[PDB]
From a paper:
One extracellular protein family that arose through domain replication and gene duplication is the gel-forming mucins, huge glycoproteins that coat and protect the epithelia in the lungs, intestines, and other organs. A remarkable variation on the theme of mucins arose with the evolution of the complex vasculature in the vertebrate lineage. von Willebrand factor (VWF), a glycoprotein responsible for hemostasis, has a similar domain organization and is homologous to mucins in its amino- and carboxyl-terminal regions. Under acidic conditions, the amino termini of mucins and VWF form noncovalent intermolecular interactions that juxtapose VWD3 assemblies from different CTCK-linked dimers.
We subsequently discovered using dynamic light scattering (DLS) that a dimeric MUC2 amino-terminal fragment spanning the D1D2D3 region but lacking CysD1 could also self-assemble, but only at a lower pH. The VWF and MUC2 tubules also both display twofold symmetry perpendicular to the helix axis. They differ, however, in that the VWF tubule is a one-start helix, whereas the MUC2 tubule is a two-start helix. The MUC2 tubule has a helical twist of ∼83.2° (about 4.3 subunits per turn) and an axial rise of ∼6.95 nm per subunit. The resolution difference between the beads in the MUC2 map may indicate greater flexibility between beads compared to the VWF tubule. The recombinant MUC2 D1D2D3 segment used for tubule assembly in this study was intact. Nevertheless, the MUC2 E2-TIL′ junction was also unresolved, suggesting that it is a flexible joint. In contrast, apposing MUC2 D2 domains appear only very weakly associated in the tubule (Right).
Author numbering:
A (entry chain C): 780 to 793, 801 to 892, 897 to 1226, 1237 to 1240
B (entry chain A): 309 to 691
C (entry chain B): 35 to 308
D (entry chain D): 883 to 892, 897 to 1170
Write the structure that this text describes.
C-alpha cells in the first residue's frame, strides 16, 4: 500500500509510511496537500490556470473549473487540410466552390463559401478566395483585399474589418468571426448560440465528432471523398476520385523538404513538445513542400511552420524561431525615415490603445496571440489609428462611420437625405440638416 | 435555378436576369434524374450510385434511412464499440484516436466506473534490446466484484487464482473458450467480450455493448462519441500528448514515467527500410488480394503502421505478419473476407497443420468436437 | 587515433589490442554512441571467404549525419547515384587513386581503403568516450572496457560476435570456436628479421613492434606455402610508419612479394602522390 | 575544380581555384566553395566561413578577413582582393601590377578581349567548351559537351520566372535604365529561376536582382526595391533587446569609425557600395 498522487484513481491493484502519500516532488505529503499535474507541469495546491475561456484551480490534487461554453473554431489551411468544429482532421483536394459553413441546413441567416484552385502540378488544390453572405451583404476576401458587394440599402448588419499583426480580421455583430492570413489560411469562429444548427465542410458543431461527415442530403458517410464531393456548388464541376501523393510524384524534391521541415522536431521547439503534438504539423509541412513545384516554394514552408508556432503561443509557449536565414520578416519598413517604433512581436502579447477602444468599442474574442509587427507609439501622440496605421494624438484619429474611415474635419459622406456630416476637430462625427423641401 | 439537390440557390443569386429555357413557378428542376421540371415531392435519392425511389428504404452501418422528398430521413440503430491493443504499442480507443505509447508497467486498460463491476489490465514492457521495442506480456482480468483474478500469459497457460485451468471453462458469470489453440475468447455476462491472439504477437480486442456509453475509464477512452476528450485524465483537464495521459493510469506506483519518441524507425535502420517497403507496399496494390478491401476500409493507416513496425522491431517478419493480419481482420468484419491471402507473405505455418487439419479462414467457435454437438447450446457465444 | 584492419582477419582498435576475429557476415566497424544524435557510422562487410590466405571486403557503407556512401570494388555511390570520382561537395570529399580510395569529412573523419584487404580509419579527439563499434571505445584505455567490461575477460570471438548487424532477409551463421592451435613461436626469428630490416630505420620509435610481430606469428603458420599472408603485415607496418611521419625505404625485392606497374613506373614507398 | 586565376603561366606567386557542383536537375552547375593559395598559406571559403590551412611558419603574407554588409571580404597585402556573398557570387579584384601576367577562366588582364580564350597550352580557340575544358584540375573529370537550356527542360516553371524577373524592366528601375543595360541581367534572372527546381528557389531570384541593383548603385543610382513581400531582409535581429541601432542601408553609402581605421589601418579599394545592415552606434 503506497499511494503516489497519480495512482489515486488507479486502485493500487498489484518509501512513504501509512497515511502520507508520495507527491512526486519530494518528501511524503498528506492527501489534503497533494499537488496536481497538467502537461508535464506540477502545480501545488490552490493554483490557478485558464483553458481558452475558463479558469481552474488545483483543490485536492483535482482540478475544479468554471463551466462556460467557449466559442467554436474551424480551420482550413495548407493544400487542403481541414479541421472541423469538433476536432476531426482530414484532407480533401477539390477544384470548385464549396460550402465552408452555412445555416440553410434544411430560414437561415448566413453562409461562408470558399474557392479552391489547383496550385502545383501534382493535382493538389488550395484555397485562394473567400465569400461571406450576411443577410444580403456580400463581402469577398480576394487579392489581399476586402471588397464589399451588394451592400443592402438600410439593414447593413453591423460588421467590422481590421488588420491585426499579419492577419485580416472580419467580425460581425451577430457572432461570426473570420481570420485570414491573406495567402491560404482561414479560421472561422462562431458564438455558442449557433450550436448544432450549421452544416458544411466544418461539421455541425454539436460537441460530437462521429457525425461530422454528414452529406448535403442528411446522410452519414464514412468516406472523405464522398462527404467532400456533395458540398460543391456548381453541378458541372468534376468529382474527386483519389488523393494525390506529392512527395511520391516528385522524388527529387523530397530530400530538401524532409530537411527544412525537420526544425519542428528539433530542440528549437523543445518547450512546446509537451503541449502540442508536432506530428500532424510535420506531415503537413512535408506534404506542402513537395507540392509547390511551380515557383515560390519558400512561402509554402514559412506558413506551415507559423501554423504550429501560433498554436504553441496559444497554449502558453512564446518561441522565437525566425533568423536572418530562415523566413526573415521585414518590419521596420513601416517606420518613419529613422525613428524606430514598429517592432516584430514574436507572440503578440501586447495590449495598447487604439482610437476604437478609446471610445468604448470592444471586440468579443482575444486575438492577442497573432504573429506580426506591432506599433509602440511614442509619448507625444499615443493613439494608434488603424485604417492608416499611424500613431496620432487622441484628438486627431478619425470617425469610423459605416465601416469607413474619415479624417478629422473631412466632410463625412452620408447616404441619407438632407443630412450633411462632418468630423469635428474633436474626433466627433456630427450631422446637421439642410433646408434646401425638408427640415431638421 | 433550384435543381432538386441544391435548394435555395435563389437566396444567394449574385446576377441579373436574361432569356432562356426555365421552369414554372414551382417544380424545381430535376438534377439527380433526367426528367424535366418535375414537382418537389418526386426527387429521387442517390447513395454511391444506385438511384433510390421516394419510398425505398435502406439500412446503413449503425442507422436506417428512408428516401423522403429529396432528402433522407435517418434513425439510429444500436451498434457496439471496440477497443484494440495491437502491435507492441498501438492503442485504438472506442472512438478511433490512434496513438503510440511504448510503456513499461502494468496499466488499467479498462474498468467499469461504478465501484466493482470489473477491471482489465495489461503488461506493456520492453521486448528487445532498446526501450523503443515493447510488447504485451500478460492480461489480467479482475471480475466478480474483484473477487476473481484470471491471468492470460503469452504462452497459453491461462490460469485462474494462481492455478492452472482446463478449457473450456463455463461458469455462471462468465466463460472462456479456446477454439483453435492460437485464440482465446472470453465472454462476460455484463456485456464485455474479449479476444486474445497468441501468435505471431500477443494482441487484445475488447468489445462493449452500447448501453455502457460513458461508464468506462482507462487507456481505451470514455466511449461517448467524441474523440477529443479521450485524453481526459481522471482528475479534470485534458492532456495534449499520448504519453502524458497514459502515465496517470499506472497500476504500480513504483514504475517510472515515459515520454513520446519523435523519430521514425525507418531512418535509423537503413538496411531494413527497403525490406519493409517492398512488402508493406502490397497493401496499396489493387491486383493483390488486399486490393479487394480497398472499397470498404482505407489502407493508408495500416500501411504506415506496417512500415513503422517492420522497421522498428528486430523480428521483422513476425511484425510484418502481425501488422498484415490486422487489416485482414478489420476487413473481415465488414463483409469482405480476404480468402487465401497467405500464399506469398506469411505462409511460414500454413502448410504445417497436423495430420487431417488444414488452415481455414472461417474457423468459428461452434465447429468444435463431438461433445460440442453433445450440448450444442451451452457454448455457442455470439458476436 | 587510428583503427585498422588488414591481413588474415587481423584487427586493431583505437587502443592497440590486436586480435583475430574471422567473422564473415556483416559488422559494425565503428559508430558514434553518444546517445543523443548519431554523427556517423561505418559498417564493414566481409566476403564469402576468398581463400585460405586472403580476406577481402565486399563493400563499405558509411553514413555521415545526412547522407550514405556505398563503396564497392569498382564504383562508389552517393545517395543512390553513381558519382564520377573525384567529388567536391562542400562537406565531403571522395577521391579514387589507383592504390587507394580516400574519403574526407568535415566532422573529423578520414577513411582510406585499398580495394582488396587493407582499411584504416582516423577520427579526431572529439569522439573520445563515444565510439562503440568493433574498433572498441576511444577513451584511450588499453583493453580496459573492450574486453573486461564487468570483470569477465571477453574472448575476441564472442566480443566480435556481439557487434553483428541483423539484415532482415538473410540468416548468417557466426564462426564456431576453433580448437586452440599451438603458439606459432617457431617462426619468430623469421618475422623479427624480416620486419626489423634496414628500410624501416626511422620508425622504430614511432610504432611499436610486439603487436605486429605477434600478428606475423599466426600469419606464418596459418598460411602455409605462398608468402601472400606474411608480407601483408609488414605492408601495414610500413603504412603505420608512413602515417606517423617517418619515411621507410624499399624492401620488396623480386623474390619478396614484388609488384608490377606498366611502363618504367617504379614502385616506391613514401613519395608524393602529386 | 577549375582554375579561376593563377600566375604560374608558363615562377608565379598565387592561385585562386573554384569548385563547381550541380545545383538542379537540368545539368547546370554553380560554384559552392573557394580555395586561395598565397605563397604557402591556403585559405578556404566554405559553409559561410573562412578556414585557414597550411599556415606557413614565419612568412605569413599579410592578409585580412572581414565582413562588410552581407559580403565577406578578403584582402592580401600583395594586391589581391576576393569578395564573396556566401552563396554563389564571387568578385576577384587584382592590382594593376599584375597586368598581362595571369591566365585562367578570367582571361589574362591585358586590355584586349580577342585573346582571352587562351587554353592551358597557349592556343587561342573559338569555342567556349574548348577553352573551359582545358582548365580543369583533375584529369579524370569529364568534359562538357553542351550548354543545357533550363527554361526548355522545365516548361511549367517558365511562366513564374518570366513574371518575377520582369521587375528589372519595370518602372521601379527607371533611373538605372540609362546607366546599365538590363538585358544580360534579365536573361540571367530567367535562366536561374528556371533551374532551381529542387528547393529554395526564392533565394536564386533575390541574388539575381541584387546583382543588377549593386551595379545601379555603383554607377550612381541608389534604388530601394525591397518590400515586405519581395525579398525581405531582417536587420533588427542584431539589435540589443529594444535599442534601435542597426538599420538596413539600401546602398551602403555610409562611412563610420571602426577600431581598425581608428589606428590608421586602411584598405586599397572602395567597398562603399555593398548592400546590407549597418550599425549606427550611439554617442557614448
Ligand atoms: C459582441 O457581442 C455583443 C453581444 O450581442 C454585441 O452586442 C450587440 O450589438 C448589436 C449592435 O451593436 C445589438 O443590436 C445587439 O443587441 C447587441 N447584443 C446584445 C446582447 O445586447 C457586440 O456588437 C459584439 N461586438 C461587436 C464588436 O460587434
Ligand atoms: C595596400 O597596398 C599597399 C601597397 O603595397 C600595401 O603596403 C604594403 O604593406 C606591406 C606590409 O604591410 C609592405 O611589406 C609593403 O612594402 C607595402 N607596400 C609599399 C609599396 O610600401 C598595403 O598593405 C595594402 N593594404 C593593406 C590593408 O594591406
Ligand atoms: C573520457 O574522457 C576523455 C574524453 O572525454 C578521454 O580522453 C578519456 O580517456 C575518457 N576516460 C574514461 C575513463 O572514459
Ligand atoms: Ca458534430
Ligand atoms: Ca470519447
Ligand atoms: Ca579502452
Ligand atoms: Ca586578353
Amino acid at each position: 500500500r503506497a499511494l503516489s498522487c497519480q495512482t489515486l484513481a488507479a486502485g493500487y491493484y498489484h518509501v512513504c509510511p501509512d497515511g502520507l502519500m508520495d507527491d512526486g516532488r519530494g518528501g511524503c505529503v498528506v492527501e489534503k496537500e497533494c499537488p496536481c499535474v497538467h502537461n508535464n507541469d506540477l502545480y501545488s495546491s490552490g493554483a490557478k490556470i485558464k483553458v481558452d475561456c475558463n479558469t481552474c484551480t488545483c483543490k485536492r490534487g483535482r482540478w475544479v473549473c468554471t463551466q462556460a461554453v467557449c466559442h467554436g473554431t474551424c480551420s482550413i489551411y495548407g493544400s487542403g487540410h481541414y479541421i472541423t468544429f469538433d476536432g476531426k482532421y482530414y484532407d480533401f483536394d477539390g477544384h470548385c466552390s464549396y460550402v465552408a459553413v452555412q445555416d440553410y441546413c434544411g430560414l437561415g441567416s448566413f453562409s461562408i463559401i470558399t474557392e479552391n484552385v489547383p496550385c502545383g502540378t501534382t493535382g493538389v488544390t488550395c484555397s485562394k478566395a473567400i465569400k461571406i453572405f450576411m443577410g444580403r451583404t456580400e463581402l469577398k476576401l480576394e487579392d489581399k483585399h476586402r471588397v464589399v458587394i451588394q451592400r443592402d440599402e438600410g439593414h447593413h448588419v453591423a460588421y467590422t474589418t481590421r488588420e491585426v499583426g499579419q492577419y485580416l480580421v472580419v467580425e460581425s455583430s451577430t457572432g461570426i468571426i473570420v481570420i485570414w492570413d491573406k495567402r491560404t489560411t482561414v479560421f472561422i469562429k462562431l458564438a455558442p448560440s449557433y450550436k448544432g444548427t450549421v452544416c458544411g465542410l466544418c461539421g455541425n458543431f454539436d460537441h460530437r465528432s462521429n457525425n461530422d461527415f454528414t452529406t448535403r442530403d442528411h446522410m452519414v458517410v464514412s468516406s472523405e471523398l464522398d462527404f467532400g464531393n456533395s458540398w460543391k456548388e456548381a453541378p458541372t464541376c468534376p468529382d474527386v476520385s483519389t488523393n494525390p501523393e506529392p512527395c511520391s510524384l516528385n522524388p527529387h524534391r523530397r530530400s530538401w523538404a524532409e530537411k527544412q521541415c525537420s526544425i519542428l522536431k528539433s530542440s528549437v521547439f523543445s518547450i512546446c513538445h509537451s503541449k502540442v503534438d508536432p506530428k500532424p504539423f510535420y506531415e503537413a509541412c512535408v506534404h506542402d513542400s513537395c507540392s509547390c513545384d511551380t515557383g515560390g516554394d519558400c512561402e509554402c514552408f514559412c506558413s506551415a511552420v507559423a501554423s504550429y508556432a501560433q498554436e504553441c503561443t496559444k497554449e502558453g509557449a512564446c518561441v522565437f524561431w525566425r533568423t536572418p536565414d530562415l523566413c526573415p520578416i521585414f518590419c521596420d519598413y513601416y517606420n518613419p525615415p529613422h525613428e524606430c517604433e514598429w517592432h516584430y512581436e514574436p507572440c503578440g502579447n501586447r495590449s495598447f490603445e487604439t482610437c476604437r477602444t478609446i471610445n468604448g468599442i470592444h471586440s468579443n474574442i482575444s486575438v492577442s496571440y497573432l504573429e506580426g509587427c506591432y506599433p509602440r507609439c511614442p509619448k507625444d501622440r499615443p493613439i494608434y489609428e488603424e485604417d492608416l496605421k499611424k500613431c496620432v494624438t487622441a484628438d486627431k484619429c478619425g470617425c469610423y462611420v459605416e465601416d469607413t474611415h474619415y479624417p478629422p474635419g473631412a466632410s463625412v459622406p452620408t447616404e441619407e437625405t438632407c443630412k450633411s456630416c462632418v468630423c469635428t476637430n474633436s474626433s466627433q462625427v456630427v450631422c446637421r440638416p439642410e433646408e434646401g423641401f425638408c427640415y431638421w | 435555378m433550384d435543381t432538386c439537390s441544391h435548394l435555395e440557390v435563389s437566396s444567394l443569386c449574385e446576377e441579373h436576369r436574361m432569356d432562356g429555357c426555365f421552369c414554372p413557378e414551382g417544380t424545381v428542376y430535376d438534377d439527380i434524374g433526367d426528367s424535366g421540371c418535375v414537382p418537389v415531392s418526386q426527387c429521387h435519392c442517390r447513395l454511391h450510385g444506385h438511384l433510390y425511389t421516394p419510398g425505398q428504404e435502406i439500412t446503413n452501418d449503425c442507422e436506417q434511412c428512408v428516401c423522403n422528398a429529396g432528402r433522407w430521413v435517418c434513425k439510429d440503430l444500436p451498434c457496439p464499440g471496440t477497443c484494440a491493443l495491437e502491435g507492441g504499442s498501438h492503442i485504438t480507443t472506442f472512438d478511433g484516436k490512434t496513438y503510440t505509447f511504448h510503456g513499461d508497467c502494468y496499466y488499467v486498460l479498462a474498468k467499469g466506473d461504478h465501484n466493482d463491476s470489473y477491471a482489465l489490465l495489461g503488461e506493456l514492457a520492453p521486448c528487445g534490446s532498446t526501450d523503443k521495442q515493447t510488447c504485451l506480456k500478460t492480461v489480467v482480468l479482475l471480475a466478480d466484484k474483484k473477487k476473481n483474478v484470471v491471468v492470460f500469459k503469452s504462452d497459453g497457460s491461462v490460469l485462474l487464482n494462481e492455478l492452472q485451468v482446463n478449457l473450456p471453462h463455463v461458469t455462471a458469470s462468465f466463460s472462456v473458450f479456446r477454439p483453435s489453440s492460437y485464440h482465446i475468447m472470453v465472454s462476460m455476462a455484463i456485456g464485455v467480450r474479449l479476444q486474445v491472439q497468441l501468435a505471431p504477437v500477443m494482441q487484445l480486442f475488447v468489445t462493449l455493448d452500447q448501453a455502457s456509453q460513458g461508464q468506462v475509464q482507462g487507456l481505451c477512452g470514455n466511449f461517448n462519441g467524441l474523440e477529443g476528450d479521450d485524453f481526459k485524465t481522471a482528475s479534470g483537464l485534458v492532456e495534449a500528448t499520448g504519453a502524458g495521459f497514459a502515465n496517470t493510469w499506472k497500476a504500480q506506483s513504483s514504475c517510472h514515467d515515459k515520454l513520446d519518441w519523435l523519430d521514425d524507425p525507418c531512418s535509423l535502420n537503413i538496411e531494413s527500410a527497403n525490406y519493409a517497403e517492398h512488402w508493406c507496399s502490397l497493401l496499396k496494390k489493387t491486383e493483390t488480394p488486399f486490393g479487394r478491401c480497398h472499397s470498404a476500409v482505407d489502407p493508408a493507416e495500416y500501411y504506415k503502421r506496417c512500415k513503422y513496425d517492420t522497421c522498428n522491431c528486430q523480428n521483422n517478419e513476425d511484425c510484418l505478419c502481425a501488422a498484415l493480419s490486422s487489416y485482414a481482420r478489420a476487413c473481415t468484419a465488414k463483409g469482405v473476407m480476404l480468402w487465401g491471402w497467405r500464399e506469398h507473405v506469411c505462409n511460414k505455418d500454413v502448410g504445417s497443420c497436423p495430420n487431417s487439419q488444414v488452415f481455414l479462414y472461417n474457423l468459428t467457435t461452434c465447429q468444435q468436437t463431438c461433445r460440442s454437438l453433445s450440448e450444442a447450446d451451452s457454448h455457442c457465444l455470439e458476436g | 587515433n587510428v583503427c585498422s584492419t588488414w591481413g588474415n582477419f587481423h584487427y586493431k582498435t583505437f587502443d592497440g589490442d590486436v586480435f583475430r576475429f574471422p567473422g564473415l557476415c556483416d559488422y559494425n566497424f565503428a559508430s558514434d554512441c553518444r546517445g543523443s544524435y548519431k554523427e556517423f557510422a561505418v559498417h564493414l562487410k566481409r566476403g564469402p571467404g576468398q581463400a585460405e590466405a586472403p580476406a577481402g571486403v565486399e563493400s563499405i557503407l558509411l553514413t555521415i549525419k545526412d547522407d550514405t556512401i556505398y563503396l564497392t570494388r569498382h564504383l562508389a555511390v552517393l545517395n543512390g547515384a553513381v558519382v564520377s570520382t573525384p567529388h567536391y561537395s562542400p562537406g565531403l570529399l571522395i577521391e579514387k587513386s589507383d592504390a587507394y580510395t580516400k574519403v574526407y569529412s568535415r566532422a573529423g573523419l578520414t577513411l582510406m581503403w585499398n580495394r582488396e584487404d587493407a582499411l584504416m580509419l582516423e577520427l579526431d579527439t572529439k569522439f573520445r568516450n563515444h565510439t562503440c563499434g568493433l574498433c572498441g571505445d576511444y577513451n584511450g584505455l588499453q583493453s580496459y572496457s573492450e574486453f573486461l567490461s564487468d570483470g569477465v575477460l571477453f574472448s575476441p570471438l564472442e566480443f566480435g560476435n556481439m557487434q553483428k548487424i541483423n539484415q532482415p532477409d538473410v540468416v548468417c551463421e557466426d564462426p564456431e570456436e576453433e580448437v586452440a592451435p599451438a603458439s606459432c613461436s617457431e617462426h619468430r626469428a623469421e618475422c623479427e628479421r624480416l620486419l626489423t630490416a634496414e628500410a624501416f630505420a626511422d620508425c622504430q620509435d614511432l610504432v611499436p613492434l610486439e603487436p605486429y610481430l605477434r600478428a606475423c606469428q599466426q600469419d606464418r603458420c596459418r598460411c602455409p606455402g605462398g608468402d601472400t599472408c606474411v608480407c601483408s603485415t609488414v605492408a601495414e607496418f610500413s603504412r603505420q610508419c608512413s602515417h606517423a611521419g617517418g619515411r621507410p625505404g624499399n624492401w620488396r625485392t623480386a623474390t619478396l612479394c614484388p609488384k608490377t606497374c606498366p611502363g618504367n613506373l617504379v614502385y616506391l614507398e613514401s613519395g608524393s602522390p602529386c
